């Protein structure tokens, strides 16, 4: 027995059941002439990718031979009977069935009535033509329909019960979300935004630091063969209830929690260890496609991922199911904030940075997804873009993904609404605090910087590869009253400020300090210049310190590669400039991946005790991979692709992996080079047979035992085949 549930949970789309080919009703006589009733001989779905069904549904891009339609919109089928259908004496219906335990009230068994006119928002089938034994139907799905791969049957009613078509896997129909249908929760009213955020399969991810924004391409490849089945498999491995898969909120809430693998559940193992033993380095991946297919084939978490890898895979998942989605990058992200709007830096009494206590860090950048949906669970006006950070963060429910948090709620500070909105708000609106940890053990708040966190938020522009600034969509113009109103609203609903920044004030001296670090190519010396400017008729003496650290892009430091001290005398109204040379040999032996450096300049004015403090980051430029193509760029023709890479270092690179990708042009490929001498160059050549026309992109990456996070791309126009 089993008293918990009357029927087991219908939570796997891969699971099926055997519907009876005959259901008897009443005491059926011996030898009934059932051949007087209709029998279905064939069913046509008009499922060809060039045909009206896939073209008008925008599902012709998918590399899938089955019928794919989007919910809430009509599509044609034809049924051929044993004899002409005769409305006076012939009752029949289409049945759509999903899972192992389909039930009509659960929406997982769907009888489609034959109707005179398709009612808005209802399942129904209209006979649009009859000719000889064939009836052609226009079928409309409900705009709230479950998304997934439905089985299809045709069932004829008789006084003796139901006659039904046998299992025909040729008829299985994918029903997806419909951004084009005004009644769908994912409806997007702009054609070009639907083209970009759903039908574009090549993304751009922005990295580096805000003064030197780096860019790379990413193959989402959501239309590639088996990716849609992999997204269904992802939801089946979540054991997500099929009746819940009609809701884009729940699909985003579950799929994001599925993206980061804790234990042996989930798609990607997170790692930031810079070593990535027994797995693939997160900076090696060119796209989601090989990650998702490795997950689907191994059934085990893929090694390894990082924030932009999680964002890419989740973006592929969302766009594949048809939820409009984009990656966004925040620069200077206050991650692991625990809804605290304060990041603390600790200083020695002399004003040097106390590295022992300074254990908070600000990520140079962080990536998360936005998904477009209405929010019927929230009050009016919180629809649209929902922030979903698939990276785990300490949250209202332990260590987990955050969101979907409404971006419109975040901007206004209405972080009372679900999900996890205070933590996303704190991601973008925290302040830096500089605290003197006095030798007596007291903590004195010396300085506050409200401007540093979330200085810019960017995403790929519609139809091009330039950045689109969306910072104003997340927060108001800095220092204006509306920022204060948003902050106070967030503080009403459980954002926190542990330390009252009331015993902190404008500097008494009115001395400014600022410094600039010039951008550099990896392996070059560069200048850092500090300026001090006096706005007073007084004369000041200042002791200043430079700390230069190699850091992970998460801002976690590894080594203090340079330390310097300056004594400055400022005359009244005067200024002074200190030039510091940083030499390649100071940093080159010690750099982590993404080659990120972080500089603190701090100073104490001896006559006024004021503390000046600023911090800045740089990312060293690494030369791109070169991609070339030869032969005719025509679908089905052979095309020759050359990937070239030149070692930029003064050392031999070892165990070099080069990866190549490009949806519709080439499957994911990778090549192993045992060594690459210091100034030497390698070439790799492949023959690829493109299968998608128009503008396409080739993408390459490089990784090794030392150097990694190196990329390249080429735009290739592919002509249509004859």
């Amino acid at each position: 027995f089993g008293g918990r549930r009357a029927v087991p949970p219908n939570n796997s789309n891969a699971a099926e059941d055997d519907l009876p080919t005959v259901e008897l009703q009443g005491v059926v006589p011996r030898g009934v002439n059932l051949q007087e009733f209709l029998n279905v001989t064939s069913v046509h779905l008009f499922k060809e990718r060039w045909d009206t069904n896939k073209v008008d549904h925008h599902t012709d891009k998918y590399e899938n031979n089955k019928l794919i339609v989007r919910r809430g919109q009509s599509f044609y089928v034809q049924i051929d009977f044993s004899r002409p259908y005769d409305p006076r004496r012939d009752l029949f219906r289409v049945e759509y069935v999903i899972g192992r335990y389909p039930q009509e009230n659960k929406g997982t068994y769907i009888p489609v009535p034959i109707v005179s006119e398709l009612q808005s928002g209802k399942w129904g089938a209209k006979i649009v033509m009859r000719e000889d034994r064939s009836v052609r139907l226009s079928i409309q799905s409900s705009p709230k329909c479950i998304v997934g791969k439905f089985r299809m049957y045709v069932a004829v009613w008789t006084p003796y019960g139901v006659l039904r078509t046998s299992r025909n896997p040729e008829t299985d129909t994918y029903i997806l979300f419909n951004p084009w249908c005004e009644d769908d929760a994912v409806y997007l009213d702009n054609e070009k935004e639907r083209e970009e955020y759903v039908l574009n399969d090549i993304g751009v991810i922005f990295y580096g630091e805000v003064n030197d924004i780096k860019t790379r391409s990413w193959s989402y490849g959501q239309f590639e063969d088996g990716i849609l089945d992999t997204c269904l498999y992802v939801m089946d491995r979540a054991q997500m209830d099929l009746s819940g898969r009609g809701n884009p909120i729940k699909v985003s809430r579950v799929g994001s929690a599925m993206v980061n693998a804790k234990d042996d559940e989930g798609v990607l193992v997170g790692s930031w260890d810079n070593i990535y033993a027994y797995g693939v380095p997160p900076s090696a991946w060119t796209g989601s496609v090989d990650i998702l297919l490795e997950y689907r084939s191994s059934e085990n978490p893929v090694r390894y991922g990082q924030c932009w890898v999680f964002a890419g895979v989740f973006n592929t998942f969302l766009r594949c199911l048809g939820i409009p989605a984009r990656i966004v990058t925040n620069y200077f992200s206050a991650h692991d904030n625990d809804a605290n709007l304060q990041m603390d830096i600790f200083l020695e009494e002399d004003g040097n940075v106390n590295s022992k206590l300074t254990k908070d860090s600000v990520w140079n950048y962080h990536c998360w997804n936005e998904a477009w949906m209405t929010r019927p669970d929230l009050p009016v006006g919180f629809g649209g873009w929902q922030a979903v950070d698939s990276t785990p963060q300490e949250n209202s429910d332990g260590m987990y993904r955050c969101g979907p948090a409404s971006v419109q709620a975040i901007k206004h500070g209405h972080v009372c609404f679900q999900f996890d909105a205070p933590f996303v708000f704190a991601e973008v609106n925290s302040d830096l605090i500089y605290i003197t940890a006095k030798k007596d053990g007291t903590h004195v708040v010396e300085n506050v910087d409200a401007t540093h966190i979330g200085k810019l938020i960017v995403t790929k522009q519609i139809g091009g590869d330039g950045m689109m600034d969306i910072t104003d969509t997340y927060k108001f113009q800095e220092g204006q009253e509306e920022e204060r109103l948003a902050l106070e609203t967030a503080l009403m609903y459980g954002a926190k400020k542990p330390l009252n920044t009331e015993g902190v004030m404008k500097s008494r001296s009115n001395v400014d300090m600022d410094f600039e670090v010039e951008n550099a190519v990896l392996g070059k010396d560069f200048k850092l210049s500090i300026t001090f400017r006096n706005n007073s008729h007084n004369r000041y003496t200042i002791t200043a310190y430079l700390s230069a650290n190699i850091t992970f892009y998460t801002g976690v430091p590894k080594a203090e590669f340079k330390k310097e001290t300056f004594d400055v005398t400022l005359e009244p109204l005067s200024f002074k400039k200190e030039a510091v040379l940083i030499q390649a040999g100071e940093y080159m032996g010690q750099l982590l991946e993404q080659a990120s450096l972080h500089f603190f300049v701090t100073a104490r004015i001896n006559e006024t005790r004021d503390v000046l403090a600023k911090q800045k980051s740089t990312v060293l430029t690494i030369p791109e991979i070169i991609i070339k193509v030869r032969g005719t760029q025509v679908v089905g023709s052979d095309m020759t692709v050359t990937v070239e890479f030149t070692n930029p270092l003064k050392e031999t690179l070892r165990n070099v992996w080069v990866h190549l990708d490009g949806p519709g042009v080439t499957r994911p490929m990778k090549k192993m080079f045992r060594e690459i001498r210091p100034n030497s160059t390698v070439q790799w050549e492949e023959v690829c047979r493109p299968w998608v026309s128009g503008h396409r992109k080739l993408i390459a990456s490089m990784s090794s035992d030392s150097l990694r996070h190196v990329y390249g791309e080429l735009d290739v126009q592919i002509q249509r085949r004859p």
Partner: protein, 125 residues
């Protein structure tokens, strides 16, 4: 331009109450969703509807009309289990044996209007 709407018995999006001086007055062709509280409904009988800014102000007008309550009908009956009725919905009531409605029939239909039922439900002896 259109001012801050005074949605009686209803609401616009909650941030507009805080950020009023930023968002308003609003340029022509901005659309603003509003919704009525429970017990109230829009002119169309919806719970949520959009207004549009025009040179004449907001249009359609953000008003929410109270649902008419089921009557404490003297000497009579009603067909329905319903307590509350939509604006410009209608309701059928009828007589105990030997009684006649306000309109003198055995049964009468009354419309929910802005001020209450189009006629007071009552059966005369």
């Amino acid at each position: 331009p259109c001012g801050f709407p005074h949605v009686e018995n209803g609401r616009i999006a909650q941030y507009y109450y805080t950020f009023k001086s930023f968002y308003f007055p609003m340029s022509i062709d901005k659309k603003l969703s509003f919704f009525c509280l429970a017990g109230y409904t829009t002119e169309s009988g919806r719970q949520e509807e959009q207004t549009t800014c025009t040179t004449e102000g907001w249009s359609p007008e953000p008003r929410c009309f109270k649902k008419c309550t089921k009557p404490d009908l003297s000497n009579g009956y009603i067909s329905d289990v319903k307590l509350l009725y939509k604006i410009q919905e209608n309701m059928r009531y009828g007589c105990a044996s030997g009684y006649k409605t306000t309109g003198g029939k055995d049964e009468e239909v009354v419309q929910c209007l802005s001020d209450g039922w189009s006629s007071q439900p009552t059966c005369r002896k």
